Every structure is written in C-alpha cells, then in structure tokens.
C-alpha cells in the first residue's frame, strides 16, 4: 500500500511509440511510455526501423481510442531528461506499455531504478511474444 495510484490524463497527441503528448492535470505535458524499447519513425540517423510506423500505429490508436486514460508514476523521476514525464500509461484499464511489448512492438528495456514496479510483467509478455514469432521477433 502507499505504493501507487493512477491519475486521469486526457490525450492531446500521439508522437512516437514511447512518446505521448498528453494533457496532464492542468498544463500540456509530453510523457514517455515506461520501460519499453519501441523503434523509431524519426531520427536524423537510423531512420524508420521495421515495425517503426506499426509500433506507433499501435500506441496512437490505443490511447486516441480510450475512454479513460490514467497515468502512473514510477518511483524514479517524473522529470525524464527532455522534461518528457516518465510514466505508465493505461487505456481503459489496460497497460499501453505491455500491449506493445506483447504484440511484439517494443522489447523490454532501459532497466534502471527504483523504477521496476512493472519489470517482471513486460518481461513475461515479451517472452510469450517471443515464444510466438510475433512482429518484431520473426
């Protein structure tokens, strides 16, 4: 207990896989999907990795289509580095981070601390997605 709780956050705009511009409690704020490693569609280098667009097409719809978006704090720091709040985005009770990590659209990633609350979860879905030969693992 005294663990966590989510707070509603209203959408504004989906940027890229791990990047969601969401109107958070007051002023507009960018947020980064916590713990996933989803490919890009922007980068002056690399370019548009395979599953790049797709991975994003997932995120944009999960959130754009949700009825109630709650965001979740990680025991590290809301301030990321680019500002971009770090959080656990949910869409109608579902974890947007896991969904992508389960449909093979971002591998588990950037392990740090004390953020890890959902570590052995994204881990189990990914394995499953790994057992399967889904999208990113094919």
């Amino acid at each position, epitope marked *: 207990t005294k663990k966590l709780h989510k707070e509603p956050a209203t959408l504004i705009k989906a940027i890229d896989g791990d990047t969601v511009k969401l109107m958070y409690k007051g002023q507009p704020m960018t947020f980064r999907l916590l713990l996933v490693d989803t490919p890009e569609t922007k980068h002056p280098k690399k370019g548009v990795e395979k599953y790049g*667009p*797709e*991975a*994003s*097409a*997932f995120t*944009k*719809k999960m959130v754009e*289509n949700a*009825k109630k978006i709650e965001v979740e704090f990680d025991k590290g720091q809301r301030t990321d580095k680019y500002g971009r709040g770090l959080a656990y985005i*949910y869409a*109608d*009770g*579902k*974890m947007v981070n896991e969904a992508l990590v*389960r*449909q093979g*659209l971002a591998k588990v990633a950037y392990v740090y601390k004390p953020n890890n609350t959902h570590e*052995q*979860h994204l881990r*189990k*879905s990914e394995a*499953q997605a790994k057992k*399967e030969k889904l999208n990113i693992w094919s």
Partner: antibody, heavy 113, light 112 residues
Framework: DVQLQESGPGLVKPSQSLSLTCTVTGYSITSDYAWNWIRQFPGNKLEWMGYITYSGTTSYNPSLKSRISISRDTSKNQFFMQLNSVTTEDTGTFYC??????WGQGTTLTVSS | DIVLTQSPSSLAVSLGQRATISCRASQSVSTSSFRYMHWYQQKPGQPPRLLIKYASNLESGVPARFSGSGSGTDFTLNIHPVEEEDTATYYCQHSWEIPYTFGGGTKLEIKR
C-alpha cells in the same frame, strides 16, 4: 497447459445472488490471464460483459454495469463474478476468457418459479 | 458503439467447396497494424474458440483453410476447402473500442 475451470450449474430464485468462477491451470494470475466475461442467452447471443486486469481495477460494459461484479482470489487462483438482484432476463451461460487465448466451458444459470 | 452485422444467418455449402462468411462493421475499424476484427468458432455444446487474430492472422493450431480478409468495414472469413468438422457458428468481434461488440452469428451447414 492453460485451462479454465468454472462453477457448476445453478437454479436461482429471481433476486438472490451467486458467484461464478474460473480457477486457472497453466498459470497463477498476477502477470494476468485478463478475464473478459461473456454472457450467452439461450439461443445465440454473445454479449461482452466486461473485463479485469493485473492492475486490479475492472471495467464493466456500459450496458449493464452495476449489480454485476468481478473479484480476485489469486492465491486460490480465481476471479469471480456476481449477479445481484437476478432477473428472468438473466438466464444464460457465462464464459470467462483469457485476454489472449482460451475460453472456459461456461456456467449456466437459470431463473424461474 | 459499433454494431456488427454478419450474414447470411445460415450458410450451407457442399463439402469441399468454398465458404465465405461476411461481417459488416457500422463504423470503420482499421489503421497501420489494425484491422481490429478477429473471428471465433463455436461448436454446439462447446465454448467459442479463437480462429483468426487481426482480420488476417491464423491462430495457433487452427487449420490453414480458414482465412480472414477485410478493410474498413467489410471483413470476411473464408474456409475454402470446407470439411465435415467445419459445422459451427462463426462469430466476429471488434476491439477498436469498448464495448467489444460481438457478431450476430453465422451458422455453417455442410451438405452431402
């Protein structure tokens, strides 16, 4: 691997609660076997009831929300569902389903004289 | 709240011939990984079983005769080399938004 055992049949008078269930082999429930309750009136009518996830909160279909619920006895590997104030308009089978595969063999409930 | 309509309500096909089951969506359900419609099969006395995962995309274990197609709102399940065990009622489901609405049902009869 993966199995969905549910409570047996149940005649019930119109208005006196009961709880279906889904013990779940091939797992334990934590990382999720996200339930997704379904109803099926005698004849042919799959109606989505609602769901419940790893987080704990649930999400009941707009249509018929309150007086119907979904619980979580994980150690005793189960999620439950209650239909308070049962009505004749409630007779049918109820299937729990995992949020990525398998369905349960369903529970039949009836409600008459 | 999208209402799905699949027809005809009854499908009787000569054993070994094609069978196309249609499922129409009120609103459109597609995107860039979506075609958010899946297909279920239900034998009598039994619970539905998953057949296809995202319009196309056969599930695991399901034979290769089943094939879903469809863009926008017209989605169809194809089971061409149709067989004896293909007697069942096949439903469509959408997960573009909750409530997840199921299909009205399409009964498949095999003639001989």
């Amino acid at each position: 691997d993966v199995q969905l055992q549910e409570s047996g049949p149940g005649l019930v008078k119109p208005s006196q609660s009961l709880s279906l269930t889904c013990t779940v082999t091939g797992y334990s429930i934590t990382s999720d076997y996200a339930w997704n309750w379904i109803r099926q009136f005698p004849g042919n009518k799959l109606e989505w009831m609602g769901y419940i996830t790893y987080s704990g909160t649930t999400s009941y279909n707009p249509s018929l929300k309150s007086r119907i619920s979904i619980s979580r006895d994980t150690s005793k590997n189960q999620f439950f569902m209650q239909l308070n104030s049962v009505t004749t308009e409630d007779t049918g089978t109820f299937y729990c389903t995992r949020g990525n595969g398998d369905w349960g063999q369903g529970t039949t409930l009836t409600v008459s004289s | 709240d999208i209402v799905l309509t699949q027809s005809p309500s009854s499908l009787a096909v000569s054993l070994g011939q094609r069978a196309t089951i249609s499922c129409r969506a009120s609103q459109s359900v597609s995107t860039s990984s979506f075609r958010y419609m899946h297909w279920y099969q239900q034998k009598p006395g039994q619970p539905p079983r998953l057949l296809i995962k995202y319009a196309s995309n056969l599930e695991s274990g399901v034979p290769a005769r089943f094939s879903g197609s469809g863009s926008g709102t017209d989605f169809t399940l194809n089971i061409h080399p149709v067989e004896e065990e293909d007697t069942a009622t096949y439903y469509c489901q959408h997960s573009w938004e909750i409530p997840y609405t199921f299909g009205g049902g399409t009964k498949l009869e095999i003639k001989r």
